[PDB]
Amino acid sequence: GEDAFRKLFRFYRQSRPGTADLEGVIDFSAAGKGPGAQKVIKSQLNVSSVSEQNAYRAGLQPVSKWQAYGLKGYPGFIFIPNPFLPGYQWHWVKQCLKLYSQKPNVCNLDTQDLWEQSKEFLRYKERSLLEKLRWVTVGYHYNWDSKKYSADHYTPFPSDLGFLSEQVAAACGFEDFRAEAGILNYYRLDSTLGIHVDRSELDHSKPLLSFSFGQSAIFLLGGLQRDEAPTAMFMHSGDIMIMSGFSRLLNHAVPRVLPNPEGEGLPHCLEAPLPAVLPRDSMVEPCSMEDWQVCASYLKTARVNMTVRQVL
Ligand SMILES: [Mn+2]
C-alpha cells in the first residue's frame, strides 16, 4: 500500500516462501534477524498454577517444559510455541471440523450431514460443506450485526476446549479465567486477514487466547495507530498467542498462510499419532481412522484458528 503496516502486509502477502524474503520474521521455535529477533524476551509462566495432572488431562506438556516469550514494546503479549503432547493437535482439529461446527452452535453456513458428506467426498475420486465452512461461534454467540454478546443467545461452552483454554490462561497468570465465548476460523492458502483492532470493550484486563493448527501463517503485530511498522512472526501448528491489557488495543494482521514447502503436505509436528490408549480422566478422546483421513486431507491446504475469551 503506502503506510508502514500496509507496505509490510503486502510484502508478506506476496513473499516467496523458502527465500530470504522471510529472514526478518521471528520464529519463536528457533529460540540473527536484526530488528525483529532482538526484541524477543522470556515471558515467565506460573508453573505451579497448572498441576501435571491438569496439563496431562488437557493434552499438554507439563508447564515446566513450556517456553513462553514476549516482545520488547508489546506489553501483555505472550507467545507459546506448540506445547501440545504429540498427537493431541489432531483431537482439537477433529473437534473443530466435526463437532463444534454442528448446528447446536452457529456457523456461516446456517451426504447432507457435514461430516458424513466429507467422509464420502474423500472416497469419491477428486464444493463440500466442510470446504465452505469459514467461521463457527461457541459459548456466548457473537452477533455480527449487533456487535455484542447476549445471555439469550448462547450454547454451553465445549467443556474440553474450555478446560484447555483455562489451563493456558492459568499458566500465563490469569488463574481466574473463564472460557465463555469462542470464535473458530477456517482458512485457505489464499486467505488473508486485514489490518484491524479487535473491537473495544471497556475492560481489556482479561486475556484473549488464540490457538493455530495446520499450515503456518505470518502474523503482524503493530502499534496503537495504523502507521507504526509491525513486527512479523510465524504462527506454526500448535502455537498459542495470548493478548491481554495493552496488547489488545494494538493493530494486527495475518497477511499470509504459507503453503507446505512441497505444495501440499502437513507440518512435522502433526506426523505423530494420537496415542492408542488414552487416560480415563482425559478431556481428549480417540480419533478414528476415517475421521483422521478427513482431517489430514483438509489440513494439507488449511489453517484452523480458535479464539477464546471471557465476556461476562
Ligand atoms: Mn484480531
Show the helix and strand layout.
Elements: H1 4-14, H2 35-38, E1 40-42, H3 52-58, E2 69-71, E3 77-80, H4 89-99, E4 106-107, H5 114-123, H6 129-132, E5 135-139, H7 159-171, E6 181-188, E7 193-196, E8 208-214, E9 217-221, E10 231-235, E11 240-243, E12 252-257, H8 289-299, E13 302-309
Antiparallel strand pairs: 1-2, 3-11, 4-5, 5-6, 6-13, 7-12, 8-11, 8-13, 9-10, 9-12
Manganese (II) ion is lined by residues 196, 198, 252.
Subcellular location: Nucleus; Mitochondrion
Protein name: Nucleic acid dioxygenase ALKBH1
Subunit structure: Monomer. Interacts with DNAJB6.
Q: Which features would summarize this protein structure in a list?
A:
Jelly Rolls, 4-stranded antiparallel β-sheet, oxidoreductase, 13 strands, binds manganese (II) ion, 312 residues, 7-stranded antiparallel β-sheet, alpha+beta, demethylase
